[PDB]
């Protein structure tokens, strides 16, 4: 049990990605310093979202962790995020939004800092008055094209930055009903979505944008003046500083007269719920950076978007820019922190890449997608079971018919072939799920996973480290959605599984 060992406990040691303004942030760090005594160290390693699972599960790691509030929903699950419970004259500072953005089964997990959302930029000398409906683009790429130029490029690879659009008329990711999330209702194929995806592939038929249009291609033909417009978030705006462009940021154009529906990303600040430091990390959040004069000193190494705190945000306001990145949040939806949404994004990701190709219709596309959603929803549950049964067998606590099938199946497994770390955890796991299906999947690997699965869960409450148990069942949830739902669809599904093994 040598994990229960600590490092650095004299200091608040802080995790915050390397794009943000840690600079300013440790300038808010330096005055934290001088009225506590204590040293503040923020770090920005890289990939510290994926490594705050393994050095968390052994009450290691940092104090405290920034990152977008969906990603904090499955630190929530593995209970490695302190529950806050801040006064009431403190939650008053922020908008309440930003609150439920940081709430997880009704415990708040995080402070909220910023608020990220997609906005429409334009270029201020090629077109002066943006457009506010996507229907006018069209018209408006014509009149561009004449003098060299282009009305709109932005990332069509990546869903998050099409999304917009096709939420506009009516599509949803999952149903959101007074903080919950109905994950048997998804909106993928609706009639909303199917309007929104077709007005896109209609851009790219009719000229007006290119499928191959990704990222790098629509940042470097704004930043240069080739295209009008582009659509895109804070994170930009500092490489169009330094441009010739002189860019504009305003709220994204309407479909059918509805506004474009953004995902929205709310910068948080989880504390580690083994952290020696949480008051000290409390203390720092609440009375050092979530001021106006903690704010600004970040906000101006690298700009924050609009911000959770309402005196500050106020003042923001006064630029256009904020405004309108506040204006497209308000009109959008807070990004949904369950863990069903990576496959939604996975999902959506394909459709929309086929649709623009044209490999698909809009319909097969988003036919496709839907189910794809909705199948990884129960692939999880199947997983979630699984794993309760496996613990149940053993005594042991933790939070209809391919249930009872595969436990069978996976209880003869372990018959015929009758240290643990996190990190030793993840190795051996990548290592053994690598070998099973190296040669092809088939549904004896396929048991054969989820038994393995099951036991390293036994074994990590063995070893007193819960929290890996919910690492694990989010690995195989991964892998279960990514690398062989195709194959089980392909295969005819659960109900052939059960066919097999079942009486």
Not at 38 to 65: M, S
Not at 350 to 375: C, F, P
Not at 427 to 436: D, I, K
Not at 450 to 469: D, I, Q
Request: charged residues 25%; negative net charge.
């Amino acid at each position: 049990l040598y994990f229960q060992g600590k490092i650095e406990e004299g200091k608040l040691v802080i995790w915050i990605n390397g794009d943000k303004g840690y600079n300013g942030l440790a300038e808010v760090g330096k005055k934290f310093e001088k009225d506590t005594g204590i040293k503040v160290t923020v770090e920005h390693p890289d990939k510290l979202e994926e490594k705050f699972p393994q050095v968390a599960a052994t009450g290691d790691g940092p104090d405290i962790i920034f990152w977008a509030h969906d990603r904090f929903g499955g630190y929530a699950q593995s209970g490695l995020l302190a529950e806050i419970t801040p006064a009431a004259a403190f939650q008053d500072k922020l908008y309440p939004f930003t609150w439920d953005a940081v709430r997880y089964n009704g415990k708040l997990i995080a402070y909220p800092i910023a608020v990220e959302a997609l906005s429409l930029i334009y270029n201020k000398d090629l077109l002066p008055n943006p457009p506010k409906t996507w229907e006018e683009i069209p018209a408006l790429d014509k009149e561009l094209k004449a003098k060299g130029k282009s009305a709109l490029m932005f990332n069509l690879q990546e869903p998050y930055f099409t999304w917009p659009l096709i939420a506009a008329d009516g599509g949803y990711a999952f149903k959101y009903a007074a903080g919950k999330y109905d994950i048997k209702d998804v909106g993928v194929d609706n009639a909303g979505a199917k309007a929104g995806l077709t007005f896109l592939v209609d851009l790219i038929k009719n000229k007006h944008m290119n499928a191959d249009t990704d990222y790098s291609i629509a940042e470097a033909a704004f930043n240069k003046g080739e295209t009008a417009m582009t659509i895109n978030g804070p994170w930009a705006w500092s490489n169009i500083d330094t441009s010739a462009v002189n860019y504009g940021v305003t709220v994204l154009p309407t479909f059918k007269g509805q506004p474009s529906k953004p995902f929205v990303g709310v910068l948080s600040a989880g504390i580690n719920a083994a952290s020696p430091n949480k008051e000290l990390a409390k203390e720092f959040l609440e009375n050092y950076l979530l001021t106006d004069e903690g704010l600004e000193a970040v906000n101006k190494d690298k700009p924050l978007g609009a911000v959770a705190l309402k005196s500050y945000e106020e003042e923001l306001a006064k630029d256009p820019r904020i405004a309108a990145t506040m204006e497209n949040a308000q009109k959008g939806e807070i990004m949904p922190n369950i863990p069903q949404m990576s496959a939604f994004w996975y999902a959506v990701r394909t459709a929309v890449i086929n649709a623009a190709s044209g490999r698909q219709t809009v319909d097969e596309a988003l036919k496709d997608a839907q189910t794809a959603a909705r199948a990884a929803a129960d692939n999880r549950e199947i997983v979630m079971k699984y794993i309760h049964y496996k613990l149940s067998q053993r005594g042991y606590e933790w939070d209809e018919v391919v249930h009872l099938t595969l436990r069978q199946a996976g209880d003869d497994f372990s018959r015929r072939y009758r240290h643990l770390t996190p990190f030793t955890a993840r190795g051996r796991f990548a290592t053994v799920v690598e070998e099973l299906f190296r040669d092809g999947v088939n549904w004896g690997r396929i048991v054969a996973f989820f038994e393995f699965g099951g036991v390293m869960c036994v074994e990590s409450v063995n070893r007193e480290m819960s929290p890996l148990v919910d690492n694990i069942a989010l690995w195989m949830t991964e892998y279960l959605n990514r690398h062989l739902h195709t194959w089980i669809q392909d295969n005819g599904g659960w109900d052939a599984f059960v066919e097999l093994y079942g009486p």
